[PDB]
Design a protein around this nucleic acid. Structure first.
Ligand SMILES: [Mg+2]
Ligand SMILES: [Mg+2]
Ligand SMILES: [Mg+2]
Ligand SMILES: [Mg+2]
Ligand SMILES: [Mg+2]
Ligand SMILES: [Mg+2]
Ligand SMILES: [Mg+2]
Ligand SMILES: [Mg+2]
Ligand SMILES: [Mg+2]
Ligand SMILES: [Mg+2]
Ligand SMILES: [Mg+2]
Ligand SMILES: [Mg+2]
Ligand SMILES: [Mg+2]
Ligand SMILES: [Mg+2]
Ligand SMILES: [Mg+2]
Ligand SMILES: [Mg+2]
Ligand SMILES: [Mg+2]
Ligand SMILES: [Mg+2]
Ligand SMILES: [Mg+2]
Ligand SMILES: [Mg+2]
Ligand SMILES: [Mg+2]
Ligand SMILES: [Mg+2]
Ligand SMILES: [Mg+2]
Ligand SMILES: [Mg+2]
Ligand SMILES: [Mg+2]
Ligand SMILES: [Mg+2]
Ligand SMILES: [Mg+2]
Ligand SMILES: [Mg+2]
Ligand SMILES: [Mg+2]
Ligand SMILES: [Mg+2]
Ligand SMILES: [Mg+2]
Ligand SMILES: [Mg+2]
Ligand SMILES: [Mg+2]
Ligand SMILES: [Mg+2]
Ligand SMILES: [Mg+2]
Ligand SMILES: [Mg+2]
Ligand SMILES: [Mg+2]
Ligand SMILES: [Mg+2]
Ligand SMILES: [Mg+2]
Ligand SMILES: [Mg+2]
Ligand SMILES: [Mg+2]
Ligand SMILES: [Mg+2]
Ligand SMILES: [Mg+2]
Ligand SMILES: [Mg+2]
Ligand SMILES: [Mg+2]
Ligand SMILES: [Mg+2]
Ligand SMILES: [Mg+2]
Ligand SMILES: [Mg+2]
Ligand SMILES: [Mg+2]
Ligand SMILES: [Mg+2]
Ligand SMILES: [Mg+2]
Ligand SMILES: [Mg+2]
Ligand SMILES: [Mg+2]
Ligand SMILES: [Mg+2]
Ligand SMILES: [Mg+2]
Ligand SMILES: [Mg+2]
Ligand SMILES: [Mg+2]
Ligand SMILES: [Mg+2]
Ligand SMILES: [Mg+2]
Ligand SMILES: [Mg+2]
Ligand SMILES: [Mg+2]
Ligand SMILES: [Mg+2]
Ligand SMILES: [Mg+2]
Ligand SMILES: [Mg+2]
Ligand SMILES: [Mg+2]
Ligand SMILES: [Mg+2]
Ligand SMILES: [Mg+2]
Ligand SMILES: [Mg+2]
Ligand SMILES: [Mg+2]
Ligand SMILES: [Mg+2]
Ligand SMILES: [Mg+2]
Ligand SMILES: [Mg+2]
Ligand SMILES: [Mg+2]
Ligand SMILES: [Mg+2]
Ligand SMILES: [Mg+2]
Ligand SMILES: [Mg+2]
Ligand SMILES: [Mg+2]
Ligand SMILES: [Mg+2]
Ligand SMILES: [Mg+2]
Ligand SMILES: [Mg+2]
Ligand SMILES: [Mg+2]
Ligand SMILES: [Mg+2]
Ligand SMILES: [Mg+2]
Ligand SMILES: [Mg+2]
Ligand SMILES: [Mg+2]
Ligand SMILES: [Mg+2]
Ligand SMILES: [Mg+2]
Ligand SMILES: [Mg+2]
Ligand SMILES: [Mg+2]
Ligand SMILES: [Mg+2]
Ligand SMILES: [Mg+2]
Ligand SMILES: [Mg+2]
Ligand SMILES: [Mg+2]
Ligand SMILES: [Mg+2]
Ligand SMILES: [Mg+2]
Ligand SMILES: [Mg+2]
Ligand SMILES: [Mg+2]
Ligand SMILES: [Mg+2]
Ligand SMILES: [Mg+2]
Ligand SMILES: [Mg+2]
Ligand SMILES: [Mg+2]
Ligand SMILES: [Mg+2]
Ligand SMILES: [Mg+2]
Ligand SMILES: [Mg+2]
Ligand SMILES: [Mg+2]
Ligand SMILES: [Mg+2]
Ligand SMILES: [Mg+2]
Ligand SMILES: [Mg+2]
Ligand SMILES: [Mg+2]
Ligand SMILES: [Mg+2]
Ligand SMILES: [Mg+2]
Ligand SMILES: [Mg+2]
Ligand SMILES: [Mg+2]
Ligand SMILES: [Mg+2]
Ligand SMILES: [Mg+2]
Ligand SMILES: [Mg+2]
Ligand SMILES: [Mg+2]
Ligand SMILES: [Mg+2]
Ligand SMILES: [Mg+2]
Ligand SMILES: [Mg+2]
Ligand SMILES: [Mg+2]
Ligand SMILES: [Mg+2]
Ligand SMILES: [Mg+2]
Ligand SMILES: [Mg+2]
Ligand SMILES: [Mg+2]
Ligand SMILES: [Mg+2]
Ligand SMILES: [Mg+2]
Ligand SMILES: [Zn+2]
Lengths: 83, 124, 138, 99, 99, 208
RNA sequence: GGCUAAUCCCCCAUGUGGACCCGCCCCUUGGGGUGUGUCCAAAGGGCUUUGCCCGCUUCCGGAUGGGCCCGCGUCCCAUCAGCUAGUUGGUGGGGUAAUGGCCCACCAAGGCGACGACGGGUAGCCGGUCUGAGAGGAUGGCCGGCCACAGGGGCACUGAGACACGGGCCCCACUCCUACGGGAGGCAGCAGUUAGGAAUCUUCCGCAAUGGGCGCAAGCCUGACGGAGCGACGCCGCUUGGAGGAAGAAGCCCUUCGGGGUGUAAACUCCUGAACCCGGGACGAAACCCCCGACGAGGGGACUGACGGUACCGGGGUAAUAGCGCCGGCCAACUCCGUGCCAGCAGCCGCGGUAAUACGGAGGGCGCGAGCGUUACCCGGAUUCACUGGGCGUAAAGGGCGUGUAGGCGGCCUGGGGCGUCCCAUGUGAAAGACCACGGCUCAACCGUGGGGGAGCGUGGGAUACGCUCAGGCUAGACG
């Protein structure tokens, strides 16, 4: 099932997440279909989250499933906003 | 040679033979002594050199030079082979490492103790 | 049969200039004529003309030299110090436009044959085309 | 693109199959000379349309047998028997070089 | 010890039998029709054929078959039946096949 | 850790004055006065003609020992400089001079390079308002180098600073003596430094 | 042997639709449409039960994932020269999701090989990595991609998917249980033991984070993972003090006995304040959930730590580890004493048989410095396998000579083609790495964000000088 989630790209004690589209079947840090974002939890930068919504909306159109955290970030960036 | 000849045949890479079958690729090898002898040097020099025949963990049997001044090595003592030859002795390709296993570091030696395996003397 | 008539032209020229001849005849073809046109334009020779020898067409290349010299060996400097083939039959060489050589930091030329015709190295870069790399001359 | 190759037919001896010799040339990766190698392809000739010494196009296809992955697209040129003669003779030279 | 994926194996066994049986029946039936076709019995071979087909599709319903396997087997049957059917064929039933 | 031992010895081996000792490398105490010859028993003996290697080596030794830097750091910094766009020698010098403790020496918070290293190390130095305790910090132009508020009352700090009154500072810097501040405005060029060193000899040294 | 439930199995029904044979249309390999005929569906559960939720069934499409096929590229030995029986093709068939000698029957007699078949030897391959001015050489640990294997060999079942590491049947070896009949096993999972070896870690903490499985959820599992532990194994940062201090204490070293050295080095003066003690103390963490709204959007709004009282901030606070190689040339650093072909050094040249700057200590010196040396291996140098970039009269190297097969190479002029060749456009060249820029941990190592680069191959378009090709001339080569 094609999915949308976080992969861990940072260092020890320095987490940096790369929001990706990939088959759930594949491992976490290995090959992904597309990189739609990045996430910084320690918020060390004025930009700690980015999305490229239109893309995320595509991947939802064809049925990718976000993990709850992934979805949280997506909504924060407003993939889901309507009116 | 013509280029056509280089296509047809081409240059030949040059193989090199290992000066140390400690086999294994190993940097050192443990063995047991057999003979602990004295040996006569090759023509240009004169001396009494201390060498030892060794049966290795590699199923190889070779003479190895005993460096330093004094040596406690005996018939059945177990020892570590180093590698590197002695230019003036026929057929000895490897060295003993002092301070390892039964090989004792050189007593009283104050100068270069890394080689020869002696530890640091205390001074007050 | 000359096995590489272009190389033969270059050489005829080399041997000629080395004994300081005023001129040399090389058996003629449009391609050789193109090469020559480039040398002439580039200052290496005084230019060339077509001739007939026993009815068979040739090209007189007129040779250019420096002035006479001081001390032992008054023989003048060469205008073509160096001339050599690059692509030969039996190993052919082609540069793309980004592989075209800077010859003696540019005091020399490289003659390329291209589908825009026979040009110098600068000429080709400016034209923006690659091709068969013929002579190197400086 | 399904791959199309051009070659000459050096063997008709099979049933509904032809052997097609296909040359290719290319620069040697070090020495840079242009070298010309070749290889035989087994191509499917259902109607026995094609004959020895025919220069034909060969197209990558759904596998016919083991060793047959290609079929004969069309006839480029008829009757080059010199090419055939070359192949036949190179193979004839094998009778030396042995014992 | 005693991993209870053990259970899986157990079920695998049950399933195994249920498949074999089902599949077995099909073979036995198909042959029947086919043989009856060689003897040019129109009606009977037809009716057996219908049963075989139905049972094939019913094998397809579950994990026994389905895929394209059922369509393959069914096709092969029907072909061979209709083909076998000509020696004075006159396929009176005509139920199973497009006329 | 760095070289710890008699310094004016190295003043003596290079045959030139490189003051890591600050004051008294001014007064006629430097021992370069009346003992310019190198250390050891053979120092007063004659001098054999130096090999090309020797020349290059020693010149590098001057350049390094001046800044009091680890050969490790030194060479890593050198390769760093060689990578950079622009002339290797000048670039190098710029990077050496860009070192924090060095800037502190330049700004005059310490009479010596080593003392400045200490000042950095113990937290007495701040950059852009924030403490920096590592002397290997690189000052980018526009940074402010201050004696941190807490230690601004320190005996030695005010001692130096009160001596710094009226003295001119480096042209790629600025200094406010009543404020203890200072600003690293630009990277120093070849000519900006009086360095008794031919850098090309050093480049050539790392060429092999 | 007996009882019994279901989202377990089976039989009719409905045929949206689909499968299949035959016909027709389009399309062109088995793609799509259509008509008749035959054949095929389902399952229920939970709530507030007049409605919603979790499910089930047939179909079309999407998405992701894979199967199979082709061009090209991918080590050494020719003292491996011939290899081949399902072997090469065909017809028909079996098998599969699907092409296929994948398998079987019958038919033909083929298929491959110096452009290196067959044989033997070594070997997972790649992104990349090391080295190199480059071309190249070498390598493929960790991280990512692919493959293969799960004690050895064979085999299938179940399933969307396996011929399945912690599933099954059989054979062999091994260990263990054994009432001697017969059974049980499978760390190349995380730790740990044992052996082998020069040598390679903790039988730790936690599911707080990310991810995965099941579940409506609450939640459960997770030795994936996130951390901590040990080892200078590697990289980076840091300390062992700073300033003053004799024309220079003592000891040790040399001495031309005048004195030179160790050396501002020490003592000592003054200053800072590693460790350490005290106090505050994290980010990593807002979702899942709850409430409003329609279980949507939106709005709000509370719970949730292994690391750990760790990082860090604030206060206080002591002058507080130095080692190792070398000093004849290459090569930076020299002198006494001791030993006299000894004892020993040694990478090569070569030192030592009484003045040893080469052995052994000492003083001094150079080099690096929490390291420094050694051994092994790779590239380097080595233009010493020479593509870049070498040679063969006497240094190693012209085959004893010819004829000529394959092959390599090809005069002048015109034209067609446009295969090589060149240009443009476009696709591809994952990420990581590399390069550039900016930024995040006080710096860096490390990390993030962005930019640029790129050989090669696919497709479309274009150029025609050279190479090729086809056609037509020529006569300077060749022959007559
Ligand atoms: Mg997968
Ligand atoms: Mg993107
Ligand atoms: Mg939407
Ligand atoms: Mg023309
Ligand atoms: Mg003219
Ligand atoms: Mg060349
Ligand atoms: Mg035929
Ligand atoms: Mg076939
Ligand atoms: Mg034969
Ligand atoms: Mg179960
Ligand atoms: Mg039966
Ligand atoms: Mg029915
Ligand atoms: Mg079929
Ligand atoms: Mg530079
Ligand atoms: Mg530049
Ligand atoms: Mg300035
Ligand atoms: Mg270099
Ligand atoms: Mg029963
Ligand atoms: Mg029972
Ligand atoms: Mg009942
Ligand atoms: Mg059912
Ligand atoms: Mg029904
Ligand atoms: Mg219908
Ligand atoms: Mg149809
Ligand atoms: Mg119908
Ligand atoms: Mg029912
Ligand atoms: Mg589908
Ligand atoms: Mg595919
Ligand atoms: Mg290999
Ligand atoms: Mg032999
Ligand atoms: Mg057989
Ligand atoms: Mg057969
Ligand atoms: Mg037949
Ligand atoms: Mg078949
Ligand atoms: Mg299957
Ligand atoms: Mg071939
Ligand atoms: Mg390999
Ligand atoms: Mg292997
Ligand atoms: Mg590189
Ligand atoms: Mg490099
Ligand atoms: Mg390379
Ligand atoms: Mg490689
Ligand atoms: Mg390789
Ligand atoms: Mg691997
Ligand atoms: Mg890997
Ligand atoms: Mg793959
Ligand atoms: Mg196996
Ligand atoms: Mg095992
Ligand atoms: Mg075994
Ligand atoms: Mg097995
Ligand atoms: Mg399943
Ligand atoms: Mg199945
Ligand atoms: Mg198994
Ligand atoms: Mg397997
Ligand atoms: Mg296991
Ligand atoms: Mg069992
Ligand atoms: Mg052990
Ligand atoms: Mg052991
Ligand atoms: Mg570990
Ligand atoms: Mg635990
Ligand atoms: Mg968890
Ligand atoms: Mg979770
Ligand atoms: Mg779920
Ligand atoms: Mg509930
Ligand atoms: Mg458990
Ligand atoms: Mg871990
Ligand atoms: Mg240790
Ligand atoms: Mg160690
Ligand atoms: Mg001091
Ligand atoms: Mg004294
Ligand atoms: Mg004295
Ligand atoms: Mg104090
Ligand atoms: Mg938090
Ligand atoms: Mg928070
Ligand atoms: Mg919240
Ligand atoms: Mg409500
Ligand atoms: Mg909301
Ligand atoms: Mg909310
Ligand atoms: Mg939770
Ligand atoms: Mg805690
Ligand atoms: Mg503090
Ligand atoms: Mg304080
Ligand atoms: Mg002290
Ligand atoms: Mg020297
Ligand atoms: Mg020595
Ligand atoms: Mg004596
Ligand atoms: Mg003496
Ligand atoms: Mg002597
Ligand atoms: Mg000596
Ligand atoms: Mg020496
Ligand atoms: Mg010595
Ligand atoms: Mg010393
Ligand atoms: Mg360090
Ligand atoms: Mg080391
Ligand atoms: Mg080498
Ligand atoms: Mg080389
Ligand atoms: Mg080189
Ligand atoms: Mg060599
Ligand atoms: Mg060459
Ligand atoms: Mg090349
Ligand atoms: Mg030579
Ligand atoms: Mg001779
Ligand atoms: Mg000779
Ligand atoms: Mg001869
Ligand atoms: Mg001869
Ligand atoms: Mg010929
Ligand atoms: Mg020509
Ligand atoms: Mg073209
Ligand atoms: Mg045209
Ligand atoms: Mg491109
Ligand atoms: Mg990239
Ligand atoms: Mg990385
Ligand atoms: Mg990086
Ligand atoms: Mg940076
Ligand atoms: Mg920064
Ligand atoms: Mg980066
Ligand atoms: Mg990047
Ligand atoms: Mg890019
Ligand atoms: Mg193209
Ligand atoms: Mg094209
Ligand atoms: Mg044209
Ligand atoms: Mg033309
Ligand atoms: Mg032509
Ligand atoms: Mg030709
Ligand atoms: Mg003609
Ligand atoms: Mg005539
Ligand atoms: Mg004649
Ligand atoms: Zn000084």
């Amino acid at each position: 099932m094609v999915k949308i989630r976080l992969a861990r790209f940072g260092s020890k004690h320095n987490p940096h997440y790369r929001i990706v589209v990939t088959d759930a079947r594949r491992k976490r840090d290995g090959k992904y279909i597309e990189k739609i974002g990045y996430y910084d939890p320690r918020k060390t930068t004025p930009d700690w989250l980015k999305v490229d919504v239109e893309r995320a909306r595509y991947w939802l159109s064809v049925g990718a499933q976000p993990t709850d955290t992934a979805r949280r970030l997506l909504r924060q960036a407003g993939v889901f906003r309507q009116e | 040679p013509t280029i056509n000849q280089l296509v047809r045949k081409g240059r030949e890479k040059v193989r090199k033979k290992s000066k140390v079958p400690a086999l294994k690729g190993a940097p050192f090898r443990r063995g047991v002594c057999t003979v602990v002898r004295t040996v006569t040097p090759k023509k240009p020099n004169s001396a009494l050199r201390k060498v030892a025949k060794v049966r290795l963990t590699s199923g190889y049997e070779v003479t190895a030079y005993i460096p330093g001044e004094g040596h406690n090595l005996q018939e059945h003592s177990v020892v570590l082979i180093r590698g590197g030859r002695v230019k003036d002795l026929l057929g000895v390709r490897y060295h003993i490492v002092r301070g390892v296993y039964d090989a004792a570091g050189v007593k009283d030696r104050k100068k270069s103790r890394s080689k020869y395996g002696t530890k640091k003397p205390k001074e007050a | 049969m000359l096995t590489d008539p272009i190389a033969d032209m270059l050489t005829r020229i080399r041997n000629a200039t080395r004994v300081y001849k005023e001129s040399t005849d090389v058996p003629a073809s449009r391609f050789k004529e193109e090469i020559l046109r480039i040398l002439a334009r580039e200052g290496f020779i005084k230019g060339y003309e077509r001739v007939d020898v026993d009815g068979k067409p040739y090209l007189r290349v007129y040779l250019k030299y420096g002035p006479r010299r001081q001390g032992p060996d008054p023989r003048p400097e060469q205008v073509i110090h160096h001339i050599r083939r690059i692509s030969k039959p039996g190993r052919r060489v082609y540069v793309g436009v980004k592989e075209i050589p800077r010859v003696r930091r540019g005091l020399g030329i490289a003659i390329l044959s291209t589908s825009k015709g026979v040009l110098t190295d600068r000429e080709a870069r400016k034209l923006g085309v690659g091709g068969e790399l013929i002579c190197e001359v400086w | 693109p399904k791959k199309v190759l051009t070659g000459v037919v050096v063997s008709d001896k099979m049933q509904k199959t032809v052997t097609v010799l296909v040359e290719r040339q290319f620069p040697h990766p070090l020495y840079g000379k242009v070298i010309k190698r070749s290889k035989k392809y087994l191509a499917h000739d259902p109607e026995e349309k094609y004959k020895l010494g025919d220069v034909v196009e060969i197209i990558e296809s759904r596998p016919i047998s083991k060793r047959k992955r290609f079929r004969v697209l069309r006839l480029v040129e008829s009757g080059r028997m010199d090419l055939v003669e070359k192949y036949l003779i190179r193979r004839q030279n094998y009778e030396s070089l042995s014992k | 010890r005693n991993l209870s994926a053990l259970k899986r194996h157990r079920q695998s066994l049950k399933r195994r039998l249920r498949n074999k049986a089902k599949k077995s029946a099909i073979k036995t039936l198909s042959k029947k029709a086919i043989q009856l076709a060689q003897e040019g019995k129109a009606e009977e071979a037809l009716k057996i054929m219908r049963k075989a087909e139905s049972l094939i599709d019913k094998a397809a319903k579950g994990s026994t078959l389905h895929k394209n396997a059922a369509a393959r087997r069914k096709s092969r049957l029907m072909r061979k039946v209709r083909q076998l059917l000509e020696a004075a064929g006159a396929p009176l039933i005509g139920g199973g096949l497009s006329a | 850790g760095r070289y710890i031992g008699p310094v004016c010895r190295l003043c003596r081996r290079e045959g030139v004055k490189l003051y890591l000792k600050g004051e008294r490398c001014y007064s006629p105490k430097c021992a370069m006065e009346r003992r310019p010859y190198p250390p050891g028993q053979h120092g007063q003996k004659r001098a054999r003609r130096p090999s090309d290697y020797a020349v290059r080596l020693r010149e590098k030794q001057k350049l390094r020992r001046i800044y009091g830097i680890s050969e490790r750091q030194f060479r890593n910094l050198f390769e760093e400089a060689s990578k950079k766009k622009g002339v290797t020698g000048s670039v190098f010098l710029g990077l050496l001079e860009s070192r924090l403790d060095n800037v502190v020496y330049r700004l005059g918070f310490a009479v010596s390079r080593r003392q400045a290293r200490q000042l950095v190390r113990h937290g007495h130095i701040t950059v852009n308002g924030r403490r920096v305790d590592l002397p290997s910090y690189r000052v980018r132009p526009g940074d402010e180098i201050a004696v941190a508020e807490k230690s601004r009352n320190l005996e030695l700090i005010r001692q130096n600073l009160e001596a710094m009154k009226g003295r001119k500072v480096g042209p790629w810097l600025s200094l406010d003596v009543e404020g203890m501040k200072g600003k690293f405005l630009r990277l120093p060029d070849r000519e900006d430094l009086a360095l008794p060193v031919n850098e090309q000899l050093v480049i050539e040294f790392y060429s092999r």
